[PDB]
Each structure stands twice: as C-alpha cells, then as structure tokens.
C-alpha cells in the first residue's frame, strides 16, 4: 500500500474541465504549489474551486486566473488580486463569498457525512438569502450545506508512507478539511518518512484521507508581508 508518487500525473491525470477542487491554504501559507502548477501548465478549465482565498496576482490559485481556468470559486476573502476583481466585475467568474467559519464547517460536514447543519453565522445578512431559517432555543439559525469535491489539493509538512500527515504552525488551516471532503486527495509534503516514524499521537491527519503522497523539492513559501521587530 504505497501511496508515494514522484510524478503528479499518477495523481491528477483524471482531473478534467468542470471538476470541483478543494484547495488548502490561507493566503500563500500552506498552499499546494506543485498541484497548482500542474493545473496551470495542463490548462484545465471551467474549474469549480473551493478555497479560503485566491492567493495573490502572480502566485497561488491566482496564477489560474491568467488563462481564465476557474468558472466559479467559493472563498471567504480575496482582496489581493487585481486580475481577480477584473474578471469578477466583468463576470467572467462567478464568486460565492462564504463566511470563513461556514466554509470550514461545510468542508468538515462534507468529510464527516453530514449533509447539512444549522449556524448562527450570516443570519440577517446577504449570506442568509435563499436559505432555510429556524429558531432553536430562542435563537436564529440558517441551514448550511456540506461541501465535497473531486480532488483535494493540500500541502503538509511530513507524511509517512501510509499517508499520515503532520502540518506545522498556521500552515495547517484548511488543508485537512480539504483532504477529508474530497474523493481523491493529493498531499504534497517536504518530507516523507517510514511508517512508524510519526508517533500515532502526534499525527494530525490519518492516512485514510490521503490517496497520493508527493514530495516537493522546493516550495517557495512566498510571504505577502514580512514583519520583523527591533
């Protein structure tokens, strides 16, 4: 049961126009650079993308906007991409803005086999439009639906050969969520270790959720704003 691959095609070859991809990362932090690069070079289009952000103009999911490869995106914030808004205003891309916690939980629900759940978040706003509303215990909630995808594209720190993952710092974010909610999950990592090397009690994402493991040679890890002290 070796999930390790040295060529992303062994993973993404079946990815086609119109597919739904769940993509980890918060800004440029914890993004799957290689899978994104792979999609960029292969030219796949009419993609439905689920991700917290769109990256930036020249990096992350943003590079997919160049050939207009994304038809629709579900995200809680963008803000950093001029090329993005250009396509948004023109309407070349459908944008569904979702409260960040709703996006996260929708993904959780999708991986956990929960079709829908109620949330206070978004009550009495545009987000509530077209959604069932209920009262529970004297409070107002709206119905949110699970999100699932064809491919999860995630980034992590280490994997073992079983696909058990550990992330590091804030790089983790949405990555495990994108894994569990996707039919096929491809994890790219900085290091791959033998089964047994990751302690069972230190493991963040059980390998059952990872179909393919890919070790990146160099991740750029671009920083949007470098802030230091003294």
């Amino acid at each position: 049961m070796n999930k390790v691959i040295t060529d992303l095609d062994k993973a993404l070859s079946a990815l086609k126009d119109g597919d739904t991809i769940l993509v980890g990362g918060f800004g440029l932090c914890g993004i799957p650079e290689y899978a994104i690069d792979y999609i960029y070079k292969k030219g796949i289009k009419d993609l439905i993308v689920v991700s917290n952000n769109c990256g930036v103009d020249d990096f992350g999911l943003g590079i997919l906007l160049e050939k207009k490869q994304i038809k629709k995106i579900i995200a809680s914030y963008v803000g950093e991409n001029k090329i993005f808004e250009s396509q948004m205003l023109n309407g070349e891309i459908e944008v569904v803005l979702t409260p960040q916690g709703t996006l996260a939980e929708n993904l959780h629900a999708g991986g956990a086999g929960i079709p829908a759940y109620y949330t206070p978040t978004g009550v009495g706003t545009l987000i509530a439009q077209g959604k069932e509303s209920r009262e529970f215990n004297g409070k107002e909630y709206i119905l949110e639906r699970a999100i699932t995808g064809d491919y999860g594209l995630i980034k992590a720190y280490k994997s073992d050969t079983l696909g058990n993952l550990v992330f590091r710092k804030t790089a983790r974010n949405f990555n495990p969520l994108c894994a569990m909610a996707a039919k096929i999950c491809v994890a790219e990592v900085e290091e791959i270790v033998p089964a047994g090397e990751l302690d069972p009690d230190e493991i963040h994402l059980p390998g059952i959720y990872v179909q393919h493991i890919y070790k990146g040679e160099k991740f750029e890890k671009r920083i949007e704003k470098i802030t230091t002290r003294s």
Binding site: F26, G27, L28, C29, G30, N52, A75, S76, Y77, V78, G79, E85, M88, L97, P99, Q100, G101, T102, L103, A104, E105, L107, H108, T119, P120, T121, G122, V123, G124, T125, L126, I127, F167, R168, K169, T170, A171, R172, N173, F174, N175, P176, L177, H204, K221, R222, I223, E224, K225, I226, T227, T228, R229, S230
Partner: protein
C-alpha cells in the same frame, strides 16, 4: 483621532481573557497592552499570538490573519480552520474587537462590503460577531465626507444584526441593550453637543 480610540479600546482588555483582534484598527490595540496576560487568537488556527519575529526568525508558515509573519507565546497551540471557528462560534472567545464602516442604533454592523466599490469578502467577521462573549466595534465617528457613521439604519450590507455590545469612536463610547443605544462616555475634550450633532442614530444619554 485613532489614538483616543485605540487607547480607550485597550481599557477593555482584562487579565485572563481570550481575545480576537480583527484586521485594521483593532490590531493596534495589542500594542497598548504589552505586558499583560492575555491570549490572542488568530482565526487561521493559532491560539497565543506573539510579537513579530527578529530578523532571521521569519517563518512563512507562521502568520496572523493579516498575512503578517509573527511568533507564538509559550503555551500557544495550533489547530485547523474548523477547530478555530468551532472555538469562535462556540462562544469560547471572551472578546472580539472589530472595525466598522457603519453601526446602526439597533446594534447592526456593516464592515465587509461597499456595493460596486469595495468587494473583498467577510472573512471571519460574520462568525466573530455572533460567537464572541463581547463584541466591541472601534471606528472613526464620521467618514471622510464628514458624514456620520453612527446611523439609525445601516446603508451598507450588514455584517450582523444586533451584534454590537459596545461602540468606541473618537467622540464617544456607546453601549447596546434592548435594541437600544446608550451614550455612556464622552472622549477627552469632546462635548455632549458635538456628539448629538455628529450622530444620526437615536440614543439615550447615560453619562
């Protein structure tokens, strides 16, 4: 302007609190509380935010909600985005401080969108306004046109309805109870009449 807002907002931070600071103005409040035991939460999966790193301790995998490189305090923890928002939505954060474009007399808040002008998204603001045990908005009282940002009803898309517990501006401090707004404090060198004059929202004077 901002100084009086920030320093007054800082007074709301208490020992042992778990606090979330929204981007923009609120982040500045951390600077006024440098030696205090307070845990700052970052919605991107960290509890225990800490100072910006020294040169060379810069780590791309470690950032705040504002995509800035940071460090962590001792006893910090990392977790995923669902967990972060479970913590927030579940009512575990004592204080969320937020900026705003408008606040209505009913406690309504608009801070994520300006139609056909500013469209970015709401990020975690919608989650925070409901979940936080106390929601404080800190805001400049009037816009660049000299127009009141404290209104009877918001003109901008709502971040949340009746979510604001306390509103701190460069003019005054207001509190909200019973879909009703009370002026409980005047900022230094500000007159009751200056506030009435610069406020559209109807309020009770509780000085």
């Amino acid at each position: 302007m901002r100084e009086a807002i920030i320093k007054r907002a800082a007074k709301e931070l208490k020992e042992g609190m778990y606090v979330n600071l929204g981007i923009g103005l609120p982040t500045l409040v951390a600077n006024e509380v440098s030696g205090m035991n307070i845990v700052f939460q970052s919605e991107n999966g960290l509890l225990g935010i800490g100072a910006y790193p020294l040169e060379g301790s810069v780590d791309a995998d470690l950032i705040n909600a504002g995509k800035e490189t940071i460090t962590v305090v001792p006893g910090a923890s990392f977790f995923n985005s669902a967990d972060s928002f479970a913590m927030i939505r579940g009512g575990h954060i004592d204080l969320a401080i937020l900026g705003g474009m408008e606040v209505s007399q009913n406690g309504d808040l608009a801070n994520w969108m300006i139609p056909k002008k500013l469209i970015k998204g709401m990020g975690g603001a919608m989650d925070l306004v409901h979940g936080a045990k106390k929601v404080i908005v800190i805001m400049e009282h009037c816009n660049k046109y000299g127009e009141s940002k404290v209104k009877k009803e918001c003109s901008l898309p709502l971040t949340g309805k009746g979510v604001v517990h306390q509103l701190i501006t460069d003019l005054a401090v207001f509190e909200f109870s019973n879909n009703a707004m009370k002026l409980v404090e005047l900022q230094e060198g500000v007159s009751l009449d200056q506030v009435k004059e610069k406020t559209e929202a109807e309020f009770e004077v509780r000085l």
